[PDB]
Design a protein around this ligand. Sequence first.
Ligand code: RIP
Lengths: 340, 18
Amino acid sequence: EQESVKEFLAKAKEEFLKKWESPSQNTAQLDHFDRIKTLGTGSFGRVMLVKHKETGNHYAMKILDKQKVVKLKQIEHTLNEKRILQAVNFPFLVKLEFSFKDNSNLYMVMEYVPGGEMFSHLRRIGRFSEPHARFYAAQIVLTFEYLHSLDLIYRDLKPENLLIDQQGYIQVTDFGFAKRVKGRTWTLCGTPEYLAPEIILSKGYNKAVDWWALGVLIYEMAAGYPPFFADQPIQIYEKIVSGKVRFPSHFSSDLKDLLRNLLQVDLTKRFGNLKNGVNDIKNHKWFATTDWIAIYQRKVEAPFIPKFKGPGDTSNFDDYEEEEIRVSINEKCGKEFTEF
Amino acid sequence: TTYADFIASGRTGRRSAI
Ligand SMILES: O[C@@H]1[C@H](O)[C@H](O)CO[C@H]1O
């Protein structure tokens, strides 16, 4: 029912805004945790598996080096990622359990999502069948519906940021580039293959960029490679803005029609950006078999359930070089990160 | 093929934000 969604999103905004205005802080400390293994990396640092000593529960702890964050001009992005993570609440968004800081680092302790990145499963299998791709895409559609209702643009959709949980469902991680923007914004950010043309062209843009990125994701899931690629980012950008795209011969007609409407250079024609908003995507023929409520309630049988031996199993993650975690005797960058 | 062209791009691994 339309009225049910409206009431849900209104209650969701009220709760989001309460936490947005009074964020939590310093809900743990470092010696409560054993460090186990690096799980992955990004533009803001490393994420490690840790074990809570008191309980034995495992977590994924994002560690940010305050001096490095300041050197790289990431103060606002880092504070904002933590503010967002402590304020949102949605089945397909990774949950923040604790956050705290010390003399050297900021720490975001997330629920550990043990099934690995979508990225690795996709590269391993090659490509996902359309039903498999559609299962994941439906979760992203609902997640963007939620985020956009809060005026949040995500801006970094890609398989690397989509973690598979024990039920086979997605958890979106890494809000380092997300922004609360009612109108338009201008920052050049994202990952080259997934950038919408209006970003590349240095236009003011809005939440429509996430819908373009959905098109890129659906294409890459179903084809095994993204729609626009090349040796160098600049060459990727020329393809993106060209308004041309080619599809594998095994793509269904319904899939191609959806992708033509998501990978639409003209903002006045892009699905998700029209007067009917997300419903143009939800009602598209390619999603005809999708039970949106059952996806949200996680009652659909997942196409793929990852293997987990037990607490702290890391088999679904690649190995990375391990470094020490140093805490300095001197407080670094205290004023900069007061609000963390 | 397009797959071959993807391999030739060298961008088949994990991708960083700009
Ligand atoms: O993960 C990759 C790199 O290996 C590094 O972690 C920075 O972000 C991405 O480019």
